[PDB]
Write a protein that binds this ligand. Sequence first.
Ligand SMILES: [Co+2]
Ligand SMILES: [Co+2]
Ligand SMILES: [Co+2]
Ligand SMILES: [Co+2]
Ligand SMILES: [Co+2]
Ligand SMILES: [Co+2]
Lengths: 358, 356, 357
Amino acid sequence: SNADKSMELMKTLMEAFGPSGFEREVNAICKEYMEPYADEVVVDKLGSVTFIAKGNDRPRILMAGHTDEVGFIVSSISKEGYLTFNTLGGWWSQVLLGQRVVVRTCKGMVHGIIASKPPHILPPDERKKIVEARDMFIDIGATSEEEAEESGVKVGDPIVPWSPFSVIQNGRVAMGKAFDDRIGAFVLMEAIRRMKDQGIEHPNTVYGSATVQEEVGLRGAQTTAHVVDPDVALVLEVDIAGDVPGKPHEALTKMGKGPGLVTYDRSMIPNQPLKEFVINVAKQAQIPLQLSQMSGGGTDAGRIHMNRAGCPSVVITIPTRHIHSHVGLLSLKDTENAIRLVIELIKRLDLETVEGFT
Amino acid sequence: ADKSMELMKTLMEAFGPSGFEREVNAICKEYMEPYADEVVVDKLGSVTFIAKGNDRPRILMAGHTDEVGFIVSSISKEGYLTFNTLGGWWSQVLLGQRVVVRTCKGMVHGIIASKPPHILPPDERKKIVEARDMFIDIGATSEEEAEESGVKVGDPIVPWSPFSVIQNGRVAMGKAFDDRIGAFVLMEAIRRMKDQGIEHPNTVYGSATVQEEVGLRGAQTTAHVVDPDVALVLEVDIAGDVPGKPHEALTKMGKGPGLVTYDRSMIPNQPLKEFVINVAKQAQIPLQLSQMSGGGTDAGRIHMNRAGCPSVVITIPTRHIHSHVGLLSLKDTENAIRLVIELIKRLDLETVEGFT
Amino acid sequence: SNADKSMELMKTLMEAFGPSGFEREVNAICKEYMEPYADEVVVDKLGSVTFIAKGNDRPRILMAGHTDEVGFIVSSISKEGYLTFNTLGGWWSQVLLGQRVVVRTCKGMVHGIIASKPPHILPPDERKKIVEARDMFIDIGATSEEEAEESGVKVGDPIVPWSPFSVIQNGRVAMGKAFDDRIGAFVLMEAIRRMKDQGIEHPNTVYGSATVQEEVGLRGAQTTAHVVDPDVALVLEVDIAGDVPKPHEALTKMGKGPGLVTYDRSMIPNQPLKEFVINVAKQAQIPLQLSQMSGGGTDAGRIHMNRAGCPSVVITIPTRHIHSHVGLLSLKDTENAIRLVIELIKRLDLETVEGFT
Ligand SMILES: [Co+2]
Ligand SMILES: [Co+2]
Ligand SMILES: [Co+2]
Ligand SMILES: [Co+2]
Ligand SMILES: [Co+2]
Ligand SMILES: [Co+2]
């Protein structure tokens, strides 16, 4: 069953180990799923894998979703057997304490807990203070520097959140980590798969790219854009979903009310003709679409749209609750509609339409 | 063999926050059916297992089976739950954590959440998020969709935290060690005494108390039922293995069970304290002298029962208690079991009267 | 007449003098009203009176409502004729200034006003500061320490708010002091009265108790629980009503029915008993508001811990502005609380009660 194989892919992706800089396990999963569906596979030297579905040489459509997740890296082993760490990507410190993580050593996976000094051994005026991430560490159950070393831990070893994947709300809502942005990778992979399976023709060549190192500076996007030389780009990301009580204007999108379209973000102002194109394609296809704006965040598009002489680009999003944290939620219905939408766009992105954007 | 570890796993994974301990105490009753001579209860929900011997002295061993948790305080119009805490929680360990709510329709999963910091003014992002301003997200999109899951005000909530063993079988990881590990010890002590026909000049009341984390409530009522002549309370100790100091948290995980020499709720009977120290030394069981400047135990109530009851707290050092996931040493646990057996062997009427 | 006699009782209770430790006048009023309705009267040595309506020896149902009210006590007489005072029970300082009080001396009632230093004789930076209760005093119109003494005042003399009882909103809403928790006492007394008057049978013995010293540490509840040895307890209290323009911190609304407390700082209720009350209310079509008091306690905090434990639940009348000179509550809510408690008592037989534990 394909619905099984899809959900099995989703589960495997969200449960895979792949923080920024260490995405090889996740991109291997992507290659394997796509062996029977991509006409060719190209890579960048940072570790981004890109799947090509052939059609007309031009225009080249780049779809990108980053497979790196926010994570950590071992910065030292203390004499008592605790690990210090640096963050990989943007974390809010207040979601870290008490959380389970797993470190990948040469000897395998080692489990631990993010910890700090307990407040009752601090002065009364220091207990009301937020604990900064610089003062946290990871407890792996070791009782000495040696016992810690026996587990295989070395400075520079990568760390991810520990967070199992499941579905809740009677099959409607997915729960787990790394939705940002493996759900975007999931969408582009499923789009390409479906186009082949149902023989859907498209007047263009599609480059579906699982980029690396987005969360640390849009690094894989820059190098993948160089490799591809795209004529138009659809970046798939998550949107911060403002479903939480308290205003509306800072987070327009709601989980379950359809994919989002980003009208402005700190890294890019979208091409306006292309924006209007997506809005219309969605309206015509009756796919609900939420206009969104990310005042203080960026995307792979920030680099892609600046490739060579420029590249018209838009960001399309799945509203997700609690990103950049151990566990988030998103709607499977929104995801499905994002897949539908992207297919409809690709169907209609011929050379003439694309030249009309510039 | 598997049976002990299967019990440990089942206990630490059971649902049982303060006031709602029935599932956990059912697990205890079932494990102990073949080992206890009799079972008495208090009306709060504490179950107590009796291993018979001489009418007097009565030895009370107690470990509380309630865990810190939460309770649903409302459903917001958008489908989020507000909650009150059950027991003492540090707010800084809450955000982003998985919980599970027990409704009339079954278990409902959720995540502790707050307003995201990028929707707040710059000066409010550096502020700690207080628990009063948090809520639980269960994936609902409206007050109704939330109601469909079965949630009602007053429904109990626990942390979601699987049990496993790490460090090559040496260290247990999970929730609710405080104080199901204490319950685990007293149950295993009673089991072993029966299995190996170990005689004891006394009657032993092994009690799985309720509602410790909210005010030592089950201990008071269980003490009334039992009328104990001496009490051994089993608890966890906050383990100071974390970098940065020593004097505020004397105990270390893996260096043996602890003996509490002073806490906010009780100053132990001194003869009894010396007795335990000697029994441990003689039996070659490592024992860490401990002091909990700002915490209490079931003993706080037990030792005040009727005319008084000599009592002492014996502890397993545990890292990260009152949080979703903690760690303790299986070796320490084993030694706590050994120690308690040796004590019970030697607590005859004469020794016990000599404490007072 | 009975509706008159009821309202006359309500008025008399809310207007009676009875701060924590000095509840004798109010408990006398209760004894008098209940002479013709209780089968027996037992007391504790703190001053709690308890009225027994006989039936089956067991189970024993304890209903409790405290008759002490928040108040004050004279802590000194200043050389200028002003009184300093300590609080009896929890008061918010911001509701005290400018308020009328009455002090009970050996010579009788002496009226006064809570006062402080006026802000225009303070430095500019001290006027924006809240006046703490420690810096307040009571003005009784005296001009010297001697003129004050003539009124009969002594250190240790009790003080209550001055606050007449009336009904407003076309007879719907009661206004006055001490609703916490004389309204609870009113309910249990009216329940017992009505059960006798209408010959309503109940498979149990009912102990209706007017406890003392709740507001200073649940003191009368502990000692009354000892005397009674109850098998199940229904504590009647007020609920802070959140009708003022944070829904989750104060769930209850005045006029939307009695409340049922699902959690409070002093007790987590027995769960079977909680479900029982919810169902009895639903079946009897009595509106019932699920409530939670994150930072307050009740007589139940002590009662449920008596001996081996006692399953208990708190039932509440939503009241606005408790622990202040004047509050409001709904007579309709009160009536429904009386109805509810009767329905519960009817159904609390030995078998049901043993099923809670
Ligand atoms: Co992203
Ligand atoms: Co991101
Ligand atoms: Co404990
Ligand atoms: Co505890
Ligand atoms: Co009260
Ligand atoms: Co009060």
